[PDB]
Design an enzyme around this catalytic site. Sequence first.
Site, short mmCIF file in Angstrom:
data_model
loop_
_atom_site.label_atom_id
_atom_site.label_comp_id
_atom_site.label_asym_id
_atom_site.label_seq_id
_atom_site.Cartn_x
_atom_site.Cartn_y
_atom_site.Cartn_z
N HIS A 19 0.83 -1.19 0.00
CA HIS A 19 0.00 0.00 0.00
C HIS A 19 0.87 1.26 0.00
O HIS A 19 0.48 2.27 -0.50
CB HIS A 19 -0.87 0.08 1.27
CG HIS A 19 -1.88 -1.00 1.45
ND1 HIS A 19 -1.67 -2.07 2.29
CD2 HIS A 19 -3.14 -1.11 1.01
CE1 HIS A 19 -2.74 -2.83 2.30
NE2 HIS A 19 -3.67 -2.25 1.53
N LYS A 43 -18.30 -5.69 8.66
CA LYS A 43 -17.15 -6.45 8.03
C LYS A 43 -16.08 -6.92 9.05
O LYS A 43 -15.24 -7.77 8.70
CB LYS A 43 -16.41 -5.62 6.97
CG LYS A 43 -16.40 -6.19 5.54
CD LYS A 43 -15.02 -6.19 4.84
CE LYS A 43 -15.00 -5.50 3.49
NZ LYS A 43 -14.96 -4.03 3.66
N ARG A 92 -3.33 -6.72 -8.30
CA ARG A 92 -2.31 -7.73 -7.98
C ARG A 92 -2.47 -8.97 -8.87
O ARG A 92 -1.54 -9.68 -9.04
CB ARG A 92 -2.40 -8.25 -6.54
CG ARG A 92 -1.95 -7.30 -5.43
CD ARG A 92 -1.70 -8.02 -4.10
NE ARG A 92 -2.55 -9.18 -3.80
CZ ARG A 92 -2.24 -10.45 -4.13
NH1 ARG A 92 -0.99 -10.81 -4.37
NH2 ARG A 92 -3.20 -11.35 -4.26
N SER A 130 -2.98 -7.71 2.90
CA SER A 130 -3.39 -7.58 4.31
C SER A 130 -3.79 -8.94 4.90
O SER A 130 -3.30 -9.37 5.96
CB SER A 130 -4.51 -6.58 4.45
OG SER A 130 -4.05 -5.23 4.34
C1 COD Z 1 -13.00 -2.19 -2.14
C2 COD Z 1 -13.26 -2.00 -0.63
C3 COD Z 1 -14.02 -3.26 -0.15
C4 COD Z 1 -12.00 -1.95 0.23
O1 COD Z 1 -10.94 -2.73 -0.36
P1 COD Z 1 -9.91 -3.81 0.33
O2 COD Z 1 -10.73 -4.58 1.38
O3 COD Z 1 -9.24 -4.52 -0.84
O4 COD Z 1 -8.63 -3.04 1.03
P2 COD Z 1 -7.04 -3.40 1.09
O5 COD Z 1 -6.52 -2.27 1.89
O6 COD Z 1 -6.72 -4.83 1.50
O7 COD Z 1 -6.41 -3.11 -0.39
C5 COD Z 1 -6.38 -1.75 -0.93
C6 COD Z 1 -6.22 -1.62 -2.47
O8 COD Z 1 -4.83 -1.62 -2.97
C7 COD Z 1 -4.54 -2.91 -3.57
N1 COD Z 1 -3.37 -3.61 -2.97
C8 COD Z 1 -3.34 -4.35 -1.84
N2 COD Z 1 -2.11 -4.89 -1.59
C9 COD Z 1 -1.33 -4.47 -2.57
C10 COD Z 1 0.08 -4.68 -2.95
N3 COD Z 1 0.92 -5.41 -2.20
N4 COD Z 1 0.52 -4.12 -4.08
C11 COD Z 1 -0.33 -3.40 -4.84
N5 COD Z 1 -1.63 -3.19 -4.57
C12 COD Z 1 -2.17 -3.68 -3.47
C13 COD Z 1 -5.82 -3.78 -3.40
O9 COD Z 1 -6.04 -4.74 -4.47
C14 COD Z 1 -6.95 -2.77 -3.17
O10 COD Z 1 -7.53 -2.31 -4.38
C15 COD Z 1 -13.94 -0.61 -0.43
O11 COD Z 1 -13.45 0.29 -1.46
C16 COD Z 1 -15.47 -0.60 -0.45
O12 COD Z 1 -16.12 -1.63 -0.39
N6 COD Z 1 -16.06 0.60 -0.45
C17 COD Z 1 -17.47 0.92 -0.17
C18 COD Z 1 -18.58 -0.08 -0.54
C19 COD Z 1 -19.29 0.09 -1.90
O13 COD Z 1 -19.64 1.20 -2.33
N7 COD Z 1 -19.60 -1.08 -2.51
C20 COD Z 1 -20.46 -1.27 -3.67
C21 COD Z 1 -20.35 -0.18 -4.72
S1 COD Z 1 -18.59 0.24 -4.97
CL CL Z 2 -9.01 -7.43 3.89
MG MG Z 3 -4.51 -5.97 0.36
#
Ligand code: COD
Ligand code: CL
Ligand code: MG
Length: 163
Positions: A19, A43, A92, A130
């Site tokens: 991140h 969640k 990813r 994560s």
């Molecule tokens: C997508 C949701 C669930 C949150 O995402 P998530 O649980 O993946 O969070 P996480 O912090 O683990 O990842 C953050 C982002 O960066 C990316 N990422 C994670 N790890 C890495 C890495 N090592 N390298 C590069 N990118 C990465 C992920 O694929 C993700 O897109 C959130 O945006 C959401 O649900 N929002 C509101 C609900 C909504 O409106 N839903 C329906 C209509 S959109």
């Molecule tokens: Cl998660």
């Molecule tokens: Mg992640």
Amino acid sequence: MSKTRVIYPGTFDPITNGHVDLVTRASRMFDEVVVAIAIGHHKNPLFSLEERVALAQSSLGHLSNVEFVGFDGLLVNFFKEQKATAVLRGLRAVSDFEYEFQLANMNRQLDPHFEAVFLTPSEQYSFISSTLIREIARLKGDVTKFVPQAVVEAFERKHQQGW
Ligand SMILES: CC(C)(COP(=O)(O)OP(=O)(O)OC[C@H]1O[C@@H](n2cnc3c(N)ncnc32)[C@H](O)[C@@H]1O)[C@@H](O)C(=O)NCCC(=O)NCCS
Ligand SMILES: [Cl-]
Ligand SMILES: [Mg+2]
């Protein structure tokens, strides 16, 4: 001209070096980057909002153009509220790519001004998520290589309350 604002949403539970790479990279291309932590009422995060924001601030606060804010609700409403240019996601894997493509299209239907840009991780963060990090910590494995030091310490101050 104009001044650009991208939201990077996530649960950041906890933040990883992955991140951090992405936010740093994004901060080079956009005027303001908003690290948006989804509270995630329905969640069940491991770390509270407060720990999650703190650990984020601790790893990325040294970037002048990065803000940090918790949100819940519909991403698109957050998007409008925040007067944002685009949302940033990292891709990813193939499933990531499939999901985010669908979602982008859906959000564009809810809000015609919506926009999604994507970044690909460098090869040294490609395997980090994560979820995996929580699983490895849970099993008393060492996550130091994959996460900022504050997050290491946070895992310990949970293993210390017992976990
Ligand atoms: C997508 C949701 C669930 C949150 O995402 P998530 O649980 O993946 O969070 P996480 O912090 O683990 O990842 C953050 C982002 O960066 C990316 N990422 C994670 N790890 C890495 C890495 N090592 N390298 C590069 N990118 C990465 C992920 O694929 C993700 O897109 C959130 O945006 C959401 O649900 N929002 C509101 C609900 C909504 O409106 N839903 C329906 C209509 S959109
Ligand atoms: Cl998660
Ligand atoms: Mg992640």
